[PDB]
Each structure stands twice: as structure tokens, then as C-alpha cells.
Write a protein that binds this DNA or RNA. Structure first.
Ligand SMILES: [Mg+2]
Ligand SMILES: [Mg+2]
Ligand SMILES: [Mg+2]
Ligand SMILES: [Mg+2]
Ligand SMILES: [Mg+2]
Ligand SMILES: [Mg+2]
Lengths: 53, 63, 131
RNA sequence: GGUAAAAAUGGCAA
RNA sequence: AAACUUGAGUGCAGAAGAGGAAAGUGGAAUUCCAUGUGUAGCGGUGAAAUGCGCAGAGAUAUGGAGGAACACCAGUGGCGAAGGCGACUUUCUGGUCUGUAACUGACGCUGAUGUGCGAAAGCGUGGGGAUCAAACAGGAUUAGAUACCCUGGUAGUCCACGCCGUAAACGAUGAGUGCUAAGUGUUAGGGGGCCCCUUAGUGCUGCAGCUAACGCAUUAAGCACUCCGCCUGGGGAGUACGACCGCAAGGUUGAAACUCAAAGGAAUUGACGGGGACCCGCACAAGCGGUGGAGCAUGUGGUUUAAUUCGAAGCAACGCGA
């Protein structure tokens, strides 16, 4: 939980908030589970994305 | 990076050893990937069973 | 598992010859030593050495490469096989490459070339053709 | 993240 | 007949693993139900609507019920004959790898017929039912829309025990064994000085050789030997008939008449694409003035006529040959 610092802008706090969300990866997870992907497809995506990484 | 367990000659990970385990988990309680930590394959497996055992006994958080 | 040790020997020779290896080592047997001795005698191979190993022995063959690295052995083929054994009468003994090559024959007079077999008028199992 | 929506058909020869 | 230890096993000392079966224990989330706060929408799409809500929805807070699946870890990572196997715990249980060299002493390989296992859907009996979702029903789209999209929704998806026996069940690559350049990553070991050597996997790159080519290349599609299965132009046809198996669905086996001169594989040059990149042109955009409406001139079509001469026909015929 980002807490606004003393003498810190809400906009500055918002920057900190956005970064923490990115590291958490909650957005990433949400998009993946929007629609069902068959087991074989899931495994392929995991592999090739890792190949990219 | 370097494997802590290999470097420090630790061959068994206790789920009861919370202090060690807290270093290998994220702030959200997520288990950290072995690339980031530098843990070996054999120890990533050991540690991870320990984290799951520790979470069961509420020594560590699930989230 | 291993079914034809003779065929293995000839393949090892073929494979080493392709890559122009100077020498090859193989597990030894009395038949394989006799085959090697004919190849040296016919000028296909330089030398044969036998090493005792407390198992079945080891044969070391040194291959011959002519000037310009031309290979003295062009080809080897197994004729008689475990799946199908091939025998010939002395009259029917085959000529390999019109006499340019040799046939190794197992006869009651020993393991010999096709020329010796025709001379001695003794036929037998055709082990292989070497040319 | 996206995404605009719709979007049919056309003789065999030479 | 007698030996041998290299194959194949056994012992001994180590190693890793989502291998399998059965109980038990968690946490996240979804749905529903119950209350509190609260208010005019929510939901959904390309846009909508159906739907839900004002009988207080959605949202937010807390509690309860139930089912299913296990984020992160997580990796051409691991294990398994294949199908497959991913929370954790315990119990039972299979296989594999390394080292050693106690022991046995060729005890091996393959494998017709057999006999078992075998994703998913499906079937039977009983149980369960959160989510998702064939069928089905609305809404929408459309020329139509028995679809795609939206709101719902039953079987089914789950469990047990039987049945079915099939998948692009794929590496479209049968099994065993040996041999044949290197380089690099990774998993589980072993050995010797971070480096080197080595065993068994798992990837990438790449010789020789092979291949129609694409490619393969110690994880061969190279070079060899053993054994098994399978092929012999396309269609008809995996159909017919018979047989066997199945509760059924169907499975396995499996023709012919007739008909054609082709079916095909790979690669090449083009063309094309509701493929991509990059660029242009009054192509669009930004503007200005027109045409299509009126009268008339003129060409054309058509119709008419004795003849309305002939030629031009999307752009690139039609105030065109003239
Ligand atoms: Mg056409
Ligand atoms: Mg099923
Ligand atoms: Mg639907
Ligand atoms: Mg089949
Ligand atoms: Mg390897
Ligand atoms: Mg006008």
C-alpha cells in the first residue's frame, strides 16, 4: 500500500503507486484469465514468452 | 547471481526458519524467481516446498 | 543387441576410412584377426596389432591412404549375414571388381581370398567383398 | 487490450 | 562338452523427480444466500439490445453455503511405455540415473497370434453441481444468419464403479546394438585440479555423409546388423457385404463394378490478399467552382424509316474518325 509521504504530491504518490502495481503484476494476471485458453495453448505461450525473455 | 544455499553450505531448508524464507519472497508474499535470487535449481525446489509448508502453518503469508 | 560382429568390423573400417583416420581399434575375435591379416596381405591396410585385455582382446588396424590421400579401400560389403547366409562352390566363386577387388571366404581350408579358393578348389561362406 | 460493423458472386477454352 | 566377462541382470554405496494409488489439510477467486451503508443505474457492444434494477440493482462492508481448480515457484525444467502427471501433508507403491565392481555367467534382442493400458467427447448406475457450456431461448448482425457477437441456459464439465478404444494418440520419424568433426546452454550425478575430465538426460548451432528438395546431422533422416509393423496411381471407399466386438454411439477387419490420366512432394518465377514495412500521385484531407434538376447544342443507345452509310463500346466508345 503506497502511503502519501509528508510534503509529497498526490501526483508524485501516484507515480509510486503505478510502479508498485507493475511489480505486483496484478494487471498482467488479470488479462491472462479474461478468457479460457486450452491447456496446450497455455503451455505454448509460457514457453515462447520465456524464449523471448 | 550466487546461490545462497550453495555458498553458505546449507543443504536442508526448514519451513520453520521464517527469517531465511522471508528473503526469498516478495513484498506481496510471492515466491521470487530463481533468476532474480540466483538460487540453484535443486534449492529452488527445496525452498519452495518450505514456503508452501510455512504458509500452511501461517508462519508466512499467502498474500 | 550386437548381431553381426564381422559387419560391425567392416562398418568401423568404412566409417574411419571416410574420415581418413590413421588407425581404428575394435574388440577382437579369431575371425576378425584373420580378416585383418588378409587386408594387410592384399595391401588394403598397413598394419594389424593385437592387444591382450583379459576380455576378448583388442585389434588395432592402421589404414592406408595413397598419395593425394586417395583411399586404398574404396568400399566394403557384408555378403553372408545372420539373416541370410551365403555360400558358393569353388566354380561359382565371385570376382569383385573384375579382380581389382577381393572376396573374403570362410572355407574348410581357413578364411581366405577368392583367388586362393579357386586355386585350392574349395568353396565356402562368402564373408564380405572388399574393393 | 483493443475494436470501427457489414463486405456474396463471376461457364470452359487459349 | 568345458571355460570367460565385456552384454544382461544381482549386491553394495549414492541421486533427483508434477511417476502411480488412497486418505487428510489449506489459501485465493467465482456463484448463491443473509444483513448494514447507500442510490439510478448496472451490464454489454463496432454500435445496440435482450437481461438485471428501482418490490433498493450495481457498488461497498461483514457473515454463511457449496463446487471446481490450485497464482507466485515455473524453466526447449522434471518424471512416465504411451495417454499423461503442477497447493500442501501422510501412508502404500513403480521406474530411472551415478559410482563401485560382491556375485551370477550370455541368463540377450525383437516379437505374429495373444494380453493390458490408452486424451477428449460419449454410454450405464449412483452421487454432485460452484464455474464454464453442445442443445435450446431471447437480443443483435444480415439479402437471409438455422452462425460469428451479446444476455441466458440443459446435458456435460466433477466423484465412484463399469463400458467405449478412438485423436494431427505427432518427432506425421518402430524397437535393439555399434560406429562416425566440432561449439555452446541446461537437469541429476561421479572424479581431479573457478577450471578440466566423465556418466545419463534435455536444447540450440554445425562437419562428413545423406536427401527430390526442404532438411537431418552422436537426441541421424549418416554408416551398419537383427526382428517386427506397414506401402505399391487417384476416385468409388474406409463405402458394401460377411464376421467379430459394443448397451448404444460405433470400433476392428475390409472389397468390387464403374471411372479417370492423372492424384501427389518439394522448390521456383509471377500474380493476388478484407498480410506487413516504406514511398508517392488533386488519391484523400483542406478549399474553390461545377455536373446530376431547366431550356437548348451535340454525340450515343434505342425505336422508327425506302434509307436513317460505315467505324468507335468500362477506365482507354459516346462535341469520337468528321
Ligand atoms: Mg471462373
Ligand atoms: Mg471423460
Ligand atoms: Mg453464448
Ligand atoms: Mg487410428
Ligand atoms: Mg548430450
Ligand atoms: Mg442537364
Amino acid at each position: 500500500k503506497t502511503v502519501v509521504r509528508k510534503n509529497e504530491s498526490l501526483e508524485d504518490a501516484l507515480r509510486r503507486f503505478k510502479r508498485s502495481v507493475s511489480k505486483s503484476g496484478t494487471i498482467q494476471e488479470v488479462r491472462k484469465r479474461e478468457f479460457y485458453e486450452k491447456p496446450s495453448v497455455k503451455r505454448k505461450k509460457k514457453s515462447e514468452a520465456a524464449r523471448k525473455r | 547471481k550466487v546461490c545462497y544455499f550453495t555458498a553458505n553450505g546449507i543443504t536442508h531448508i526448514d519451513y520453520k526458519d521464517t527469517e531465511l524464507l522471508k528473503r526469498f519472497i516478495s513484498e506481496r508474499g510471492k515466491i521470487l524467481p530463481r533468476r532474480v535470487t540466483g538460487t540453484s535449481a535443486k534449492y529452488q525446489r527445496m525452498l519452495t516446498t518450505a514456503i508452501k509448508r510455512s504458509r500452511h502453518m501461517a508462519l508466512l503469508p499467502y498474500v | 543387441t550386437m548381431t553381426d560382429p564381422i559387419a560391425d568390423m567392416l562398418t568401423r573400417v568404412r566409417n574411419a576410412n571416410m574420415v581418413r583416420h590413421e588407425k581404428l581399434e575394435l574388440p577382437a575375435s579369431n575371425i576378425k584377426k584373420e580378416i585383418a591379416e588378409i587386408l594387410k596381405s592384399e595391401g588394403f591396410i598397413k598394419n594389424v596389432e593385437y592387444v591382450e585385455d583379459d576380455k576378448q582382446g583388442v585389434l588395432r588396424l592402421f589404414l592406408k591412404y595413397g598419395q593425394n590421400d586417395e583411399r586404398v579401400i574404396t568400399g566394403l560389403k557384408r555378403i553372408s549375414k545372420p539373416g541370410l547366409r551365403v555360400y558358393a562352390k569353388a566354380s561359382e566363386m565371385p570376382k569383385v571388381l573384375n579382380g581389382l577387388g577381393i572376396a573374403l571366404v570362410s572355407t574348410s581350408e581357413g578364411v581366405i581370398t577368392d583367388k586362393e579358393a579357386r586355386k585350392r578348389n574349395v568353396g565356402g561362406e562368402i564373408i564380405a567383398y572388399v574393393w
